[PDB]
Amino acid sequence: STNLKDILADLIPKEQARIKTFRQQHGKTVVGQITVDMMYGGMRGMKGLVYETSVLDPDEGIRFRGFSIPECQKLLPKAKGGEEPLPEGLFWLLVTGHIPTEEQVSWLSKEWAKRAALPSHVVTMLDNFPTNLHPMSQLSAAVTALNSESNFARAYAQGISRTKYWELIYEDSMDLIAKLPCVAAKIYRNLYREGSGIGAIDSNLDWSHNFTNMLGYTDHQFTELTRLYLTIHSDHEGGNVSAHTSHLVGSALSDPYLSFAAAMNGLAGPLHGLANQEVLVWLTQLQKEVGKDVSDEKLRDYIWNTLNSGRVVPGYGHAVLRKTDPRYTCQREFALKHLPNDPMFKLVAQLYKIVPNVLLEQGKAKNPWPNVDAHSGVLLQYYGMTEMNYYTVLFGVSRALGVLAQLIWSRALGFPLERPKSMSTEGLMKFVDS
Amino acid sequence: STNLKDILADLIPKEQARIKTFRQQHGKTVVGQITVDMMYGGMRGMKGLVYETSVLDPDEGIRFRGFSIPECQKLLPKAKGGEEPLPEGLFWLLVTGHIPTEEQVSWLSKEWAKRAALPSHVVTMLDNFPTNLHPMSQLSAAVTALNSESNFARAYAQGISRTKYWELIYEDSMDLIAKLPCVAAKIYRNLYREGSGIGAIDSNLDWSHNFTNMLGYTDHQFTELTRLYLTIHSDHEGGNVSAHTSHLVGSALSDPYLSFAAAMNGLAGPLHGLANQEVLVWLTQLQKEVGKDVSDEKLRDYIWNTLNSGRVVPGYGHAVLRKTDPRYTCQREFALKHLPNDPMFKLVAQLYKIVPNVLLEQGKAKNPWPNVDAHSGVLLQYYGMTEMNYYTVLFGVSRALGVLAQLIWSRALGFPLERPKSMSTEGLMKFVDS
Ligand SMILES: CC(C)(COP(=O)(O)OP(=O)(O)OC[C@H]1O[C@@H](n2cnc3c(N)ncnc32)[C@H](O)[C@@H]1OP(=O)(O)O)[C@@H](O)C(=O)NCCC(=O)NCCS
Ligand SMILES: CC(C)(COP(=O)(O)OP(=O)(O)OC[C@H]1O[C@@H](n2cnc3c(N)ncnc32)[C@H](O)[C@@H]1OP(=O)(O)O)[C@@H](O)C(=O)NCCC(=O)NCCS
Numbered sequence A, B: 001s002t003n004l005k006d007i008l009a010d011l012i013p014k015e016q017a018r019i020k021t022f023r024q025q026h027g028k029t030v031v032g033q034i035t036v037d038m039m040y041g042g043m044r045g046m047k048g049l050v051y052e053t054s055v056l057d058p059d060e061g062i063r064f065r066g067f068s069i070p071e072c073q074k075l076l077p078k079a080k081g082g083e084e085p086l087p088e089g090l091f092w093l094l095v096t097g098h099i100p101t102e103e104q105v106s107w108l109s110k111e112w113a114k115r116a117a118l119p120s121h122v123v124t125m126l127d128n129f130p131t132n133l134h135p136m137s138q139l140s141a142a143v144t145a146l147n148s149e150s151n152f153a154r155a156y157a158q159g160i161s162r163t164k165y166w167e168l169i170y171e172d173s174m175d176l177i178a179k180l181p182c183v184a185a186k187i188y189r190n191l192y193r194e195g196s197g198i199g200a201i202d203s204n205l206d207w208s209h210n211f212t213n214m215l216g217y218t219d220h221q222f223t224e225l226t227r228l229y230l231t232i233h234s235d236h237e238g239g240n241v242s243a244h245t246s247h248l249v250g251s252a253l254s255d256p257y258l259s260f261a262a263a264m265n266g267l268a269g270p271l272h273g274l275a276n277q278e279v280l281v282w283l284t285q286l287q288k289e290v291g292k293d294v295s296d297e298k299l300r301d302y303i304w305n306t307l308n309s310g311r312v313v314p315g316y317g318h319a320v321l322r323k324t325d326p327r328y329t330c331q332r333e334f335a336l337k338h339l340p341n342d343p344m345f346k347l348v349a350q351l352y353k354i355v356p357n358v359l360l361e362q363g364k365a366k367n368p369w370p371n372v373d374a375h376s377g378v379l380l381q382y383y384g385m386t387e388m389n390y391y392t393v394l395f396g397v398s399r400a401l402g403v404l405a406q407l408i409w410s411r412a413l414g415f416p417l418e419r420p421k422s423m424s425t426e427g428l429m430k431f432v433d434s
């Protein structure tokens, strides 16, 4: 009905059987080869893990359990008075493989609202943190400290049956998702709103709304952006560092709290979670260098400079995707309707016309189109979320959705300890010579 | 000379060139195949990554840059008045590939002693933590909060050259290793010594000694055990979850602090870091069930019960190793000389005679010999380290050695973002049908 845990109880045995069958038939089917470059090249191209919740076609971008962003935009339930998809509904999709109903979504909003309370020790911890401790550091430490609340960790050590793992994981994952906005907003307020309180969860507001309230914003459209934001950042295959980290750490039977916090430390990495910031920085430098308002051909010549000087035009390209990110388009649409005359956006809008035209000519590229990160920055800034250091906190709150959805399934399906084999260069050399 | 950073400056270009050469020749050499079972089976058997510091021959156990535990026991410098190898020397080995000199070791002791101070905010954090927050949770959160001290994170965001990455990483790794005992001991004292202070670093004592002092022990032989302990837990290939996690998170250019803390959350997992505890628990239950003193044939029959009832005799077997763990033998030797009449040990000693004899007959096994975890427990208990929840803190303090040694080399060699490809079951099915 509306009880997700019950629907999950239904789905799991079917998937387990489907998997076991496939492994009996095709377990020894070679699905690719491992080269020396793949070992040195951070496993690039190597099919390495099964992750069920989302799949990225390098052609049309990301699909959540079969559905594209555009479909999600239309099918997923919206806020009462909204036109953006509730991330609750997206969680539901990743977990069940089914588009939810308004009732299902509403039920999930209430569930998360019921579970959202922080333990005192985590409030103390956040409240005592200095202002120079990075937001993501605060987040990761806080979530680690939450592991005191873990069902799974307690029950595991009592000797619960493997079959029951997923159930504990679900409860913890549900608890964690509920608390994350609280954590995230306590960080925001401690850092930028002089330690004021987050205030109260409204039991009748959606997750994204209770969030933006706790962050101390009130503008309708910032809450709609957030809804979009949290939806579209939620998942991106299992190969990305935050996903994979979560998966790897979970594989050792570390609870969702420890699994998520590990993931956040990977999300904190410049090469994964910071591109938003780097775009916004680069743009600000662009406007400083050749001016805030510009003709297309002027804009064009600046581009080449960045390149030939040994610098990446940021927000463009991707490790695997090979076309304009649905997650960009998504945001563009949001900005063709809600701030078409915002100047930073106009510039974002302009680079979409010029950057692609060049870049390919530079050769070194593969992916000549914008990624999600090219666009998120100006939207956040526009509503007064100007604190760039904080922006990955948003991303993480979102990415909890996908990686916890998967973590449940990973435990449900009994995936084992991730434990690839390493080789030293020397050993790898003595291997190939043989 | 004694300045490790200088020797590292020397070694790196040589290794870079050796690697580049090998990649030019053999980059496309297939070194194995990926099956469907490897994707579902947590990458088991799949050569996936290059990790230089240690290699595990499934036959003779672990080698540190070419040397076995027995060699390390003889070659590595010892404390002045010691017979156990200083883990400083082991760090030196993993970093340089060279057995160090007493002078090199002494220099490293002094370096770590100089860098050991904790920032106030981390002391506040530890000092405010409740007693029910797991030691490993405390550790991981503390190390995350240390990232405020990161050289690498600050310099990265200023736009330092890739070539300089390793240098920053080395400084951070050196700082972190130095602070870890302080963190670890502050946790120990807060939890078990009523919040007493850790006291002072002696600038003329080795790392292991300054540790056991801060932990509030004084017995010579506990400090010698610790020296052995920290040495032999230090590294175990890059495939183990803590190593790999560190490697994965580092690959995103997260600083050593974030990389290590992520690793600790994986080490916290029952399937990686808890076997020590599970052994000690199982043993205590064994003595409760059939008595504290026992004949060999009695002991023998109990074993079968554990098995046939659907339970693992813990401390025996390993994901990859296939013989008596050097890390066990190591400890046995330490207990054939320092507590041969300790009863818990006698029992450990007795199971080494009976368990192997059976187990294989159970079939399900592959690895019928003891791992390191079968032995560490009774040694720690013997000197009054009876707090089992804390034992993984020790393991982590040790494992920092190997995974930071590697993290330096990973940055030195310019290893890229780890980013394997995932597939859903459904996608994997539509792949094989094609
Ligand atoms: C995302 C990104 C890292 C993917 O690159 P990759 O998969 O590692 O590598 P590529 O296949 O693009 O490498 C081909 C070349 O194109 C370059 N390149 C890729 N995108 C580029 C861009 N937008 N501007 C300039 N050069 C670019 C790479 O630096 C590389 O140059 P090289 O051959 O001299 O090393 C890259 O597009 C980039 O740096 N973009 C900016 C950062 C960003 O937007 N990140 C967010 C996604 S996580
Ligand atoms: C370490 C360990 C997990 C490795 O097992 P693995 O590589 O996952 O799997 P194996 O190749 O041993 O699996 C073969 C069978 O032997 C069993 N097995 C392995 N060691 C065993 C032991 N000491 N006692 C009983 N059964 C054992 C496994 O449970 C498995 O049974 P199954 O076929 O019914 O599933 C396993 O030896 C174990 O559980 N030991 C105790 C825990 C421990 O000491 N861990 C520390 C190392 S991280």
Ligand SMILES: O=C([O-])CC(=O)C(=O)O
Residues within 6 Å of the ligand: A235, A236, A239, A240, A241, A272, A273, A319
């Ligand atoms: O997919 C990637 O590697 C890029 C990304 O950060 C994500 O969306 O998670």
Ligand SMILES: O=C([O-])CC(=O)C(=O)O
Residues within 6 Å of the ligand: B235, B236, B239, B240, B241, B272, B273, B319
């Ligand atoms: O090698 C493994 O997987 C077991 C272990 O925990 C280690 O020593 O790190």
